Symmetry: C3
């Protein structure tokens, strides 16, 4: 009929209607609504500022650029995670602080449906909101889906360790996007009083960080972390970041006389110059030689003193803060294929032996952070089993997957529980049909595999079996129900126990049913080993 | 006597005294009083900001730079319009937001004479305030003459179609200069309560735009448009300007990922780089090949939503706004020689035929905007007369002159009349002795010809006959009288009827006398044709 | 037992303890506390802005950079003035607005000791705060010593003569540092109510300027000028500075179309480009050829209308302002060796004759500003004595030393006296053992020779005789006592008469005793001659 025209605080917005077959009420889709002023020029390495009001009707009908990142790695990930039919080719630009909205509400009438803000993952180095289509989830569960974006890599996490460039710019963008929702979502038939944040991987770590951040207080009422939390060391930088700053500065051809000097110099660099720098620093790829403790992984969350007053560990060790329903989950094989492949892991052989194992585990320091003195014990605890070289490789992948997501996730869940807030956990175990062709038939429940069920990929792509079509319907029910009541349960779905003392959790997959004490053994072991 | 020292809001200003022979009270001349903060750096493509106060006495005794523009074309025009003896060689700089004042009032005593603010023309691409000397008009009619400047070309009209660079910067500069007058002219013996704005060519179109703009409300009490109004299509960009922005961006060696990106990039360019971009774009010159509908003539007035809430046409279709005495006039041969000679029209042959006529009229699209399907009818209506090839060229020149000034001007005048405000029209028909040597003696009342009478050129230059010396005295009387009572009439001058229902207008020239229905036939014809 | 951690308005600061042998309570030393936001980028040529607050504990344990300047000349001076054992190699950076604090107070308890802010010298073109160690003075006299820094050369004194770059940035930095002290020193056991400012050479001239500046009112309660005041023409630019600005602009490869243009262009230059410009200008070195009245010796204090409402001379001619105890002193031979040795003065011959004398005095115009018509009289009044060519050199050096410091200092002292405020004068006459090896042993009271006694160099360096060790103890007592009661006197010290009508002053040196009418003869003579 007629293009959707909503009125926001900064001005009228124009969208387009899209009908999901099987549903009458077409969903109103807005692409590219700016939630902050383009962090260009001097605004670089500074908190996001409010957007400028527009005089007439703004057309939110074109996919917004994605924050500057490594185009190759970026598009690759966008194609592997996208839940839509065709992958949308995105553009790169520092001007990327936008968000997309998918509202199934009949805008003609006053609607206040629950809101679900999605924070995409990509190790805080790559990623885009347009990758995740909300058409299905919005219609299928009748909730407003919001996909936001935030500065990545240098642009969003460069910190000099002091006031001259605290850092966490990216995290502040996410908060900024959340404030925008509180002041506008109501015009999109969404209830600003019922906003649920959820993300995968880095997005999960972000969701976890927002949960600990005082700034995010009152900006959301429910949180979900998918394969990633604030205890996922690889994403949270501790200690003196000054050295990393200086290394970047030099790589960017800048002086390092003082923090201010560095920041000023980098603000002079062109988007393009910093993009090259990014590639030079070779992030998201595991260094094989040199000292494993010097292979900086990827700029990340720091303890700026604004967003995070102290390390996550310290923070969660307190029950004096605002608590909300939190759902933390993981997948059967987090380090199954996706991450290992991307990082260009040396596993190219097919199998692995105790000796080469302790070697890789060492070079994998920037990911697991395991002292070289502990390497032996850890290796033995996991590969000490069968003498099967091929199995050691599989047990090795479990080793990493546990230190990065398994143990961290459960630890966070427990603390959220002991804090006195509704906690829920799950373990996605299913191999989507939308997986890559280069993904072994064996790998089931790899990193990001639940993203297809969560975003109803079966209802957008083709070939999904009735089994997958059903699984998706369930997951969305759970997620949506959680967004609503802060409880996944609802008639028509298996019972999902609350992660309390019994530590009950739901095993999601072809066979969905409750269970108890997730990674309980693992958490225990690693806690001791790491306690030196 | 001792140099004039006036006290303005921002600080003391120093000028110089200049006596016009025949007048006792010497006129106080101030050159280069800044009315806004230099729109340099990030201030580019943004509204003008207030000037910084100075600590002591500022010497307004040196002609201010002229806004960056084609130096050649610029000086050429400055020499052809200047009314002073010698042409003042101007400098180019982005730092050009200044104004010159010519006050005949005895500053030693409280004086509140009428103020006349002059907006120079030049297709918004070139021009300068220093070109027009106010010494004669100020003394001869005892009124304060103010010549202002405003950003030109890219610097003053680059619009991305959205909030990232709405545009009309130039028009905002004019408004800014008007506000300055309301807060300072009183210190120059001028009455802030009686400010009359007037300009020629784009200056007229500007005066016409200020009349429709809500921002200009209460900044002036009388307006005069000389050969140019808001209905002069070549100076108003309607539709999506986004494509033009992008074309400039590229030409400037910029990316066009997003509006913000474009604007940011251009703000990085040097004044010099944007000046070259300007030469490349080749404005002011009619493209002969390619598609006539793609030859963008020059950057201009847009509907930003701040200065203009909608197209002039829509605006004038309302009688719910602030109305003031408006005087709109034209010259016998608007497209006689000046304009064509500048744009390089292929008429050097001397004559023209029906066939080549329809051709030129087509390529002249960016000026007359005549559908190729209408070209035939229009051509026939004008050249269908004598078979004289030489006369067809003239009739052809009348064709264009009517669509650009004739019909537009009358249409505006009528609406201002029907609105209920004092309206006046005229048709200057005289060939000044100060014309160019390359201008054929047959062309009478060519574009800008009245500028010599209006600015008492005969009293500054040499060789003016007693007839011209007299004509000038009259025009100034009329103009000044209008500035005073909002009515040109006054004892000692022919009767100038008010442009009411009878549509009476004054025919100015060697033979000055009233007449009726100016371009009445033309307006009617073109209205029908264009309505097809 | 633990590094000192003070809490300032902007955040916690970390320092280090250092014990001066012979004193129990170790002094807390803070190096690099920022008192203003790095004047980088667009902040260049603008007043200093407040510093950004830091989230945790800032380590003030590393010597801050020194403001960009001629590194050679800079380090040379730092080595000749330093009172510490080893000369600290400093870094150059526009990011130099820092200050160092030396507090002998036991931070564990509430202490409010007198504060002494030191303004280093270096002709407003070189210098650093780290050069002067306060450990000794702080302990020995139990007062908080603060060494500040301020923009130098172009960075701190470039003025276009108007609001587009008034100038005196450097002086504003000093004021900024003083405001910081009023809002923080109390956290360092210092009494914000008893702040004494003191400096040598340009520092003295600054102290003298701050005394005349309305902005500095209430930021200090006592002032001391060592060899340098606001009447030291060489460091006070009068007249139109526009020409100097333009000359710099060009030398920097900038246009000079307008002030704004110049300032904008220079803000584009890199720290490095402006540093080369500095070197190209050659300020230190007295020009030998060309016109002496065109050899701009500086970039200095101007009459911006903000810091100074008018020339020092005019200002001191008033008794309607805030007055405080002022101590102005000079050294026996101000132009003895140091200054002349730096400007590469052509005195290498060893002697000088009446003829060559009048020659040098002329080329020394930018220092003494003596009309070529007066050169003869002046020369005769000083060298007209013995026919000894070698003595003429000596008397010649006295000539300059009197016009630059002698007469100016006394004139200032008298006016401060006649104003009605406690005035004190002295004449340091002693040759420190810490002098340069290339310094003749016949030169006593060279420029800056008192700096070793004032900063207890004998207690940091080695070889000081008991005579020098004693002299130092005395001077510090005097200085400290003054800072305390605004009176140098105190039991255990020779009587220091107040510079009243008797014009009594103290002769400091191996033989310390009062005297009267300092440079009385000189002041008189030069006053007449200069009055033409
Ligand atoms: C795609 C191909 C299977 C052949 C087929 O399906 O016809 C399989 C066989 C061996 C596989 C490789 C080996 O298993 C060794 C590596 C194992 C890692 O988990 C992924 C990368 C890794 C380098 C694998 C890439 C890909 O999955 C390969 C190359
Ligand atoms: C500039 C040139 C004079 C020759 C020269 O200077 O060497 C003159 C001679 C022929 C002139 C042209 C012809 O007279 C035909 C046209 C007459 C119109 O009145 C002006 C445009 C018009 C297109 C003229 C432009 C310009 O004045 C021309 C081109
Ligand atoms: C350093 C040297 C003494 C040699 C030594 O001590 O072994 C002395 C002897 C001659 C001196 C120079 C001569 O006395 C001439 C000049 C005298 C001025 O007062 C200082 C600069 C001046 C140019 C002196 C510089 C320096 O003090 C010199 C060069
Ligand atoms: C830059 C561009 O050409 N794309 C489009 C952009 C983007 O959609 C928005 O910036 C959100 O991404 O703006 C419009 O949509 C709009 O507001 O009218 C028009 C334009 O077609
Ligand atoms: C150097 C230069 O070009 N500027 C001239 C200005 C101009 O009047 C303003 O730029 C406005 O035109 O006037 C001065 O006398 C002045 O402001 O004191 C300085 C100089 O003569
Ligand atoms: C490279 C540099 O100069 N910065 C050093 C600063 C300076 O010492 C202070 O800014 C005073 O100069 O101290 C730090 O420890 C700090 O403040 O956190 C960081 C770093 O060591
Ligand atoms: C075809 C090879 C391209 C090179 C691949 C570049 C590596 C991209 C890495 C993808 C980001 C996902 C990492 C997740 C880390 C985490 O947050 O746990
Ligand atoms: C590059 C060589 C210089 C050629 C001269 C270019 C011609 C400039 C003419 C200025 C246009 C002024 C007339 C206004 C016409 C209009 O209203 O559009
Ligand atoms: C190219 C210029 C940079 C060279 C550095 C300038 C050196 C100046 C000499 C040191 C300052 C001591 C002289 C005091 C000046 C005075 O107040 O008269
Ligand atoms: C904006 O979208 C509307 C609705 O489709 C359309 O009419 C208009 O042309 C669009 N404007 C732009 C910028 O293309
Ligand atoms: C600051 O210095 C102190 C010791 O002087 C030390 O405890 C601390 O680690 C330093 N902080 C940093 C991060 O440099
Ligand atoms: C104003 O200052 C200018 C530039 O310094 C100078 O030429 C002039 O003497 C001053 N005023 C006048 C015109 O006397």
């Amino acid at each position: 009929s007629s293009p959707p025209v909503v009125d926001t605080v900064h001005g009228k917005v124009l969208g387009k209607f899209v009908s999901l077959e099987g549903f009458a009420q077409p969903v109103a889709i807005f692409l590219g609504i700016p939630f902050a002023k383009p962090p260009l020029g001097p605004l670089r390495f500074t908190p996001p500022q409010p957007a400028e009001p527009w005089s007439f009707v703004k057309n939110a009908t074109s996919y917004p650029p994605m924050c500057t990142q490594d185009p190759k790695a970026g598009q690759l990930l966008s194609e592997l995670f996208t839940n839509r039919k065709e992958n949308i080719p995105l553009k790169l630009s520092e001007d990327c602080l936008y968000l997309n909205i998918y509202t199934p509400a009949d805008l003609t009438k006053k609607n206040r449906l629950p809101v679900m803000v999605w924070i995409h993952g990509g190790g805080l180095m790559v990623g885009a909101a347009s990758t995740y289509d909300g058409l299905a989830l919005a219609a299928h569960e009748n909730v407003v889906v919001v996909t936001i974006q935030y500065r990545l890599g240098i642009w969003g996490f460069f910190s000099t360790g002091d006031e001259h460039s605290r850092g966490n710019w990216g995290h502040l963008d996410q908060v900024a996007a959340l404030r925008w929702v509180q002041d506008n979502i109501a015009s999109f038939g969404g209830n600003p009083g019922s906003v649920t944040i959820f993300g995968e991987s880095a997005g999960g770590e972000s969701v976890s960080v927002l949960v600990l951040s005082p700034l995010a207080k009152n900006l959301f009422h429910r949180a979900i972390s998918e394969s990633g939390v604030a205890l996922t060391s690889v994403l949270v930088k501790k200690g003196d970041v000054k050295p990393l700053a200086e290394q970047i500065a030099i790589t960017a051809g800048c002086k390092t006389t003082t923090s201010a000097v560095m920041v000023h110099c980098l603000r002079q660099k062109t988007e393009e110059e910093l993009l090259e720098t990014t590639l030079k620093m070779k992030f998201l790829s595991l260094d094989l030689q040199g000292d494993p403790r010097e292979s900086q992984p990827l700029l990340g969350t720091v303890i700026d003193g604004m967003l995070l007053l102290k390390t996550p560990e310290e923070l969660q060790a307190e029950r004096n803060f605002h608590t909300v329903p939190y759902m933390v989950g993981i997948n059967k094989q987090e380090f199954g294929w996706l991450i290992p492949m991307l990082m260009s892991y040396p596993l190219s052989e097919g199998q692995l032996d105790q000796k080469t194992a302790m070697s890789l585990l060492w070079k994998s320091y920037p990911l697991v952070c395991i002292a070289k003195e502990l390497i032996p014990e850890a290796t033995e605890k996991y590969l000490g089993g069968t003498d099967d070289t091929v199995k050691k490789k599989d047990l090795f992948l479990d080793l990493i997957a546990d230190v990065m997501f398994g143990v961290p996730s459960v630890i966070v869940a427990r603390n959220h529980r002991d804090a006195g807030a509704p906690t829920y956990m799950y373990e996605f175990q299913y191999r989507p049909s939308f997986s890559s062709d280069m993904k072994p038939k064996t790998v089931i429940g790899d990193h990001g595999d639940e993203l297809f069920s969560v975003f109803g990929a079966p209802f957008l792509k083709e070939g999904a079996s009735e089994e997958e079509i059903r699984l998706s319907k369930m997951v969305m029910k759970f997620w949506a129900n959680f967004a609503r009541n802060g409880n996944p349960n609802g008639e028509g779905l298996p019972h999902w126990p609350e992660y309390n003392q019994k530590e009950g959790y739901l095993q999601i997959g072809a066979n969905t049913q409750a269970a108890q004490k997730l990674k309980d053994k693992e958490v225990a072991f690693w806690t001791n080993l790491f306690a030196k």
